[PDB]
Design an enzyme around this catalytic site. Structure first.
Site, PDB file in Angstrom:
ATOM      1  N   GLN A  61       0.750  -1.238   0.000  1.00  0.00           N
ATOM      2  CA  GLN A  61       0.000   0.000   0.000  1.00  0.00           C
ATOM      3  C   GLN A  61       0.790   1.304   0.000  1.00  0.00           C
ATOM      4  OE1 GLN A  61      -4.234  -0.729   0.373  1.00  0.00           O
ATOM      5  NE2 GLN A  61      -3.604  -0.417   2.494  1.00  0.00           N
ATOM      6  N   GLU A 172      -3.804 -12.534 -20.018  1.00  0.00           N
ATOM      7  CA  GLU A 172      -4.765 -13.498 -20.506  1.00  0.00           C
ATOM      8  C   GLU A 172      -5.234 -14.364 -19.377  1.00  0.00           C
ATOM      9  OE1 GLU A 172      -1.899 -14.686 -23.626  1.00  0.00           O
ATOM     10  OE2 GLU A 172      -2.960 -13.406 -24.966  1.00  0.00           O
ATOM     11  N   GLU A 367      -8.642  -8.488 -31.130  1.00  0.00           N
ATOM     12  CA  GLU A 367      -7.293  -7.989 -31.074  1.00  0.00           C
ATOM     13  C   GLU A 367      -6.511  -8.812 -32.062  1.00  0.00           C
ATOM     14  OE1 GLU A 367      -4.984  -8.246 -27.145  1.00  0.00           O
ATOM     15  OE2 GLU A 367      -6.380  -6.636 -26.867  1.00  0.00           O
TER      16      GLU A 367
HETATM   17 CA   LIG Z   1      -1.950  -4.373  -1.388  1.00  0.00          CA
END
Ligand SMILES: [Ca+2]
Length: 516
Positions: A61, A172, A367
């Protein structure tokens, strides 16, 4: 197009940004001017990769969305839209490519075991993305990531057109089954990525949940396992793919294996819907690989798709409709080869995903897999995209059309099109009972002159005795076409006397009336 309808009225073309950050390519001012040039050629948005490896690098964070912000500033300056891809996977990583953005190295210390990475049939470890099996670390880490991003991109919500998610390696939703490191690179068969102690465990606890007891397992699999520790993933992927896949065990292993992807899809699509729906109010989607090699190999059928986790695409796409995610598929520019040694069937694969997707109401985005060097590949892309109802085509990649004006002009002509509603009208048609009228034309949006698969249908107007129909067309492009009657037997009886045309198709809604 297919089923007698036209092109999608919501088709929009998009540009994939480079891999490298824009300041490692050019400067923000010629980038803005390039975005203006793009939009001048029909590009609506620029889809770009924001790597987790950059956005939450130092620690948990300790967030940095400065580049994403700076990037959306120029997109806003250029008066363009963008499609961020919250790339929670590794960029490049190896020798000779245009990036190396690992996933933040502090993630790997959340657990002591192997819950988090992948191990193949031969022991190769893969750490490109977090293992979907470790859904507790994935709910913590992705949930937080997604919401810190929604908080910082809120200034820029008017410039965000959609949001894409990464569901695995290379963005993917699949397993890391084809890699140079594991000896599984194209065009060989992949290897299964279920050999960490943790996957092995999770398969045995699943199996046991279905049957109840080892005894019940041996009854259903027709086996004679000693202990529960003998409930394992295949020990020979080559034999498995050869025919072990046909046994009830084989069917249960692949249900488990593909099932983890399906659950991962409902989970990232949940976390992203919570975090981006109030704020942004845009469609969210994820990507699926076009693992077209070893498709029709007689010895090991669908030899690369099954190790990647793609065993039943209908069931896989069902996880996408339930999670409310759009799907991007990837080889519209290729054709079917289907021969030794690659057994490549990419155009049949894209036709199959496209059809399941339309049958289920999942929005398709296309794509191209590799760079396009010629008009031909653009014309092939035009055919799939416009005849199989793609709501969007994302060209791969930036530098290809941005530093080649001729190619860009070819893109503008074939794929950087704006759909516009038009009424086609044909008078004096000698339609006997049972007959039907269709129109086919020269451009892929009108069917490339095809009459059995792709023609658009016109309906008889009893009040004025003509066949008419509201067709979606490429605004301001020259089109040629002809009407024809398909007898009840699906047979082409006859064609319009003189070929018609619209040079160009007006940008406004009119009607083109013509006679037989
Ligand atoms: Ca985190």
């Amino acid at each position: 197009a297919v089923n007698g309808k036209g092109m999608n009225p919501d088709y929009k073309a998009y540009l994939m940004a480079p891999l490298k950050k824009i300041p490692e390519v050019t400067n923000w001012e010629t980038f803005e001017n390039d975005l203006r040039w793009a939009k001048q050629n029909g590009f609506y948005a620029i889809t770009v990769d924001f790597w987790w490896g950059d956005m939450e690098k130092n620690g948990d964070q300790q967030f940095d969305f400065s580049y994403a912000q700076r990037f959306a500033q120029s997109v806003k300056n250029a008066g363009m839209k963008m499609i961020p891809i919250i790339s929670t996977h590794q960029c490049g990583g190896n020798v000779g490519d245009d990036c190396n953005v690992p996933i933040p190295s502090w993630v790997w210390n959340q657990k002591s075991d192997d819950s988090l990475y992948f191990k193949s049939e031969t022991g190769t470890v893969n750490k490109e993305t977090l293992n979907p099996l470790a859904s507790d670390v994935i709910r913590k880490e992705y949930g937080e990531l997604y919401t810190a991003f929604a908080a910082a991109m809120k200034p820029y919500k008017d410039v965000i057109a959609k949001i894409y998610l990464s569901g695995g390696p290379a963005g993917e939703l699949r397993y890391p089954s084809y890699t140079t490191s594991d000896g599984t690179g194209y065009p060989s068969r992949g290897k299964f990525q279920a050999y960490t102690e943790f996957a092995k465990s999770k398969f045995r606890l699943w199996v046991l949940n279905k049957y109840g007891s080892l005894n019940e397992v041996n009854k259903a699999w027709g086996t004679k396992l000693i202990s529960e520790l003998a409930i394992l993933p295949p020990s020979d992927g080559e034999q498995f793919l050869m025919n072990g896949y046909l046994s009830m065990y084989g069917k249960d292993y692949l249900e488990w294996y593909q099932g983890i992807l399906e659950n991962h899809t409902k989970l990232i699509g949940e976390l992203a819907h919570n975090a981006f729906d109030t704020t942004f109010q845009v469609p969210i989607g994820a990507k699926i690989a076009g693992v077209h090699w070893q498709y029709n190999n007689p010895t090991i059928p669908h030899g690369a798709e099954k190790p990647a986790g793609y065993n039943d695409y209908s069931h896989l796409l069902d996880a996408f409709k339930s999670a409310k995610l759009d799907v991007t598929f990837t080889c519209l520019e290729m054709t079917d080869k289907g021969s030794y040694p690659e057994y490549s069937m990419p155009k049949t694969l894209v036709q199959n995903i496209a059809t399941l997707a339309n049958e289920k109401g999942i929005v398709l985005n296309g794509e191209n897999a590799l760079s396009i060097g010629n008009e031909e590949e653009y014309k092939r892309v035009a055919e799939m995209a416009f005849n199989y109802n793609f709501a969007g085509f994302t060209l791969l990649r930036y530098q290809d059309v941005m530093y080649n004006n001729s190619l860009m002009g070819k893109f503008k002509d074939l794929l950087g099109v704006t759909p516009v509603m038009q009424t086609i009208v044909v008078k004096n048609v000698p339609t006997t009972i049972g007959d039907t009228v269709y129109i086919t034309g020269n451009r892929a949006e009108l069917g490339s002159w095809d009459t059995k698969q792709y023609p658009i249908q016109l309906y008889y107007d009893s009040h004025s005795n003509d066949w008419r129909g509201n067709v979606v067309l490429p605004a301001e492009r020259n089109i040629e076409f002809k009407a024809f009657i398909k007898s009840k037997d699906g047979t082409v009886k006859s064609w319009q006397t003189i070929q018609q045309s619209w040079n160009p198709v007006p940008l406004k809604t009119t009607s083109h009336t013509s006679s037989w």
